[PDB]
RNA sequence: GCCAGGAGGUUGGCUUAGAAGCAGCCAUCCUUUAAAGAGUGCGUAAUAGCUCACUGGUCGAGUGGCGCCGCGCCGAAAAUGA
């Protein structure tokens, strides 16, 4: 009598392996994330893969219904600035190049994400987050 | 105290995932018990007392009768998952009589998906004959038992029909000692018939053995039967060879085989040298008595240094043998931690002056090798080059001019162990066409190595082991506990079927007898695979005390 | 006691049936191992001395 | 660690009282159980 | 937590039951032998008597068992800690 | 003390088998906000989670702490009766 289970996780693009909370909440359901490596990998045909959340349900009967989302902000510095994997200490060794430019479209793709659900604000937040990963933002 | 029904039901599908489907319901908890209600024949059964020299079908005094209905309907309703008449019959309201009920629970049972959880109490004779009749009602016979897997003389699949009219195939399993008839074998036949006095045939080590008296353990007495049946079992006398779980054929039974891949696997190894060693071969033949009346364990002889190594699954297994060890063998044993296969090395590139200023009693005899040596990563190997600055050191100082190296490698200066992880690289020498027999310069190579390691850094390498850890999560929490407590690290993890398994590094010296440790670190829900890998150094101070010479 | 030479098997038991006969080596050699006994059981791939060096029969099958 | 000539408050859960004339260290955690010994 | 007699008669895993009298100013009251209330017009007899009962039977001890006022059953790790 | 808020890029960059405020290395964002820190301890296999910090709801008068100084308290066991 498993009424509802719209349970969510942090399922990156191409990891079909249902273990907790996909075991006792979505396996206590019959949630097929096979449909996640089949209707979401195909969905994110942009490049290929990316870390993107998910949200499947069992509706008292025994159904399935899901929603997916968006890829990280440490990816947008990595596959952009030429920060191969990580700069090791974001204070001392600044590797990549993200000036006032790039960061604009960068934060653009990620607007309903973030916080202030806009784009006339979080530009300097993403361009300040550059130092969390430590990338020399050139004075444009 | 704390009797149940429910919790059992739960724990089946909360440990494995097995549907019970039940058959009867109690009349009281702890000491509230008086008899038993049943949901098959629907009969208010009840005994009287402990020994139960009085039983009866007295009415249900109320309280629980009604509940049965709800509960009992499941039975009928579960018969909608396997039967045929019961889809419609339950959609109706027409009573399924006692006849197809039997057949249906029996159905799912033999088919493997149903579980007449009849229960009861032993000491106070209450629950007995009920379960007897439960056994008949839902326990089959070799008749319902599927095609017994065996093999042909060729190597193809064969079915072993009951066939009390064809082939004469058989198995045995238990070797009971008995001063009357002698070495006895509990046998499950299979096919054919076996007369008291007939012969047979070994079916692995050909030996047309004699059967003499077919006798079944008849409770107290032992019923002597002229003939043994196609499927039925018993003890047959004789079979002076005949071991455990081995294939046995009748004189006919055209030399087939029977499968039974049946294998156990060891996990706890210990080592032993008792008294003043004068007990060794004694316990050797004693062992010959061990793994032949029952296989179980191994006597694996140490590959490197002395001592035998006694290993096997269980634990107090090894130690109950230990109990019977100083019993019918009388042997002052000191079974402790095993040895540690030790190999050592260096950590630097040094050139040494392998100078050998010598004239002896004649025949020259010297070897001045300007040698240079270097090592290699953990578990790499041993390589070299001629390193010849022209031809300084001639040909016959090749086939073994090293070997003084290879030899001295066999006992690295410090504690004396094989020296792996090295890579040489000489570079110069000095000789004479007479003052350099093969012998001489090669021995110069020996000195070269010894003083090279002496002044090239000390270091041993304790044998490291890789291992699975087959463990349900919870106590993976606990086992990461003791594993990271055991001078090592893990490095690996994936969720399997029921459980989750850890790819592991551990140090052997700090890994001994871990199967017994795991036991309660987990309550015991899986083990591992003793997967050898390589070796590392024992952080100087561990090595230090272990420097004893 | 020696063995039938060429590749052993015996670690520490075998019940080698003490056979007999020296040779100008191993200051003894007498009382040989058997290759059959309670261990050893010959050399797999011995298409010859079946009478001793183990091998039931080089049954080609294929 | 009962009975030590020095006694203290280790975390923000451990608070000292006075009882029977001797100084006592409390903290819900009994592994910090200290007394002026 | 049987209430037989005027007394509170409990069997808390000890080899025998336990017999509590209701002295002055106090009665007991067992809504069910799984939980026990005591009647009393006195704050001392409250804490003290209830204490005396929980002192009839200690709580938890690593796992979970015994008597408690209505507090928290803090635990100590099971299949470990015994080297 | 008592109600409630106790957020987002993020799972900070690195290490690291995994290090997600939270075993360590460097950290030294900015954004929605009354306020929620790249974290106070606790908790994990890492996770989860408890809690705090912080601001407003109740409440309605004094409070949190840093040194000095006078006297004590612990520190502090011995041999026939104090």
From Swiss-Prot, chain A:
GO MF annotation list: large ribosomal subunit rRNA binding; structural constituent of ribosome
Family: Belongs to the universal ribosomal protein uL11 family.
Its job: Forms part of the ribosomal stalk which helps the ribosome interact with GTP-bound translation factors.
Domain of life: Bacteria
Identification of the protein by name: Large ribosomal subunit protein uL11
Organism of derivation: Thermus thermophilus (strain ATCC BAA-163 / DSM 7039 / HB27)
A Gene Ontology biological process term: translation
InterPro entries: Ribosomal_uL11 (IPR000911), Ribosomal_uL11_bac-typ (IPR006519), Ribosomal_uL11_C (IPR020783), Ribosomal_uL11_C_sf (IPR036769), Ribosomal_uL11_CS (IPR020785), Ribosomal_uL11_N (IPR020784), Ribosomal_uL11_N_sf (IPR036796)
From Swiss-Prot, chain B:
GO biological process: ribosome disassembly
GO cellular component, one term: cytoplasm
UniProt superkingdom: Bacteria
Gene Ontology MF annotations: GTP binding; GTPase activity; translation elongation factor activity
Keywords: Cytoplasm, Elongation factor, GTP-binding, Nucleotide-binding, Protein biosynthesis
Subcellular location(s) per record: Cytoplasm
Major subcellular location class: cytoplasm
Family classification: Belongs to the TRAFAC class translation factor GTPase superfamily. Classic translation factor GTPase family. EF-G/EF-2 subfamily.
Job of this protein: Catalyzes the GTP-dependent ribosomal translocation step during translation elongation. During this step, the ribosome changes from the pre-translocational (PRE) to the post-translocational (POST) state as the newly formed A-site-bound peptidyl-tRNA and P-site-bound deacylated tRNA move to the P and E sites, respectively. Catalyzes the coordinated movement of the two tRNA molecules, the mRNA and conformational changes in the ribosome.
Protein name per Swiss-Prot or TrEMBL: Elongation factor G
Range within the parent protein: 142 to 690 of 691
From Swiss-Prot, chain C:
Name of the molecule in the record: Small ribosomal subunit protein uS12
Record key words, sorted: Methylation, Ribonucleoprotein, Ribosomal protein, RNA-binding, rRNA-binding, tRNA-binding
Full protein: residues contained: 65 to 126 of 132
Job description of the protein: With S4 and S5 plays an important role in translational accuracy. Interacts with and stabilizes bases of the 16S rRNA that are involved in tRNA selection in the A site and with the mRNA backbone. Located at the interface of the 30S and 50S subunits, it traverses the body of the 30S subunit contacting proteins on the other side and probably holding the rRNA structure together. The combined cluster of proteins S8, S12 and S17 appears to hold together the shoulder and platform of the 30S subunit.
Highest taxon in the source lineage: Bacteria
GO BP, sorted A to Z: translation
Modified-residue entries (3-methylthioaspartic acid), positions: 25
Family recorded in the similarity comment: Belongs to the universal ribosomal protein uS12 family.
Compositionally biased spans, kind Basic residues: 45-56
The UniProt record lists the keyword Acyltransferase: no
Record keyword Oxidoreductase present: no
Residue ranges of the TM segments: none
Subunit description: Part of the 30S ribosomal subunit. Contacts proteins S8 and S17. May interact with IF1 in the 30S initiation complex.
Sample GO molecular function, one term: rRNA binding
GO cellular component: small ribosomal subunit
Encoding gene per record: rpsL
Region (Disordered) location: 42-62
Signal peptide positions (record): none
UniProtKB/Swiss-Prot annotation, chain E:
Superkingdom in the source lineage: Bacteria
Function according to Swiss-Prot or TrEMBL: This protein binds to the 23S rRNA, and is important in its secondary structure. It is located near the subunit interface in the base of the L7/L12 stalk, and near the tRNA binding site of the peptidyltransferase center.
Family: Belongs to the universal ribosomal protein uL6 family.
Assembly behavior: Part of the 50S ribosomal subunit.
Record protein name field: Large ribosomal subunit protein uL6
Naturally occurring in which organism (per UniProt): Thermus thermophilus (strain ATCC BAA-163 / DSM 7039 / HB27)
Origin organism lineage: Bacteria, Thermotogati, Deinococcota, Deinococci, Thermales
Gene name per UniProt: rplF
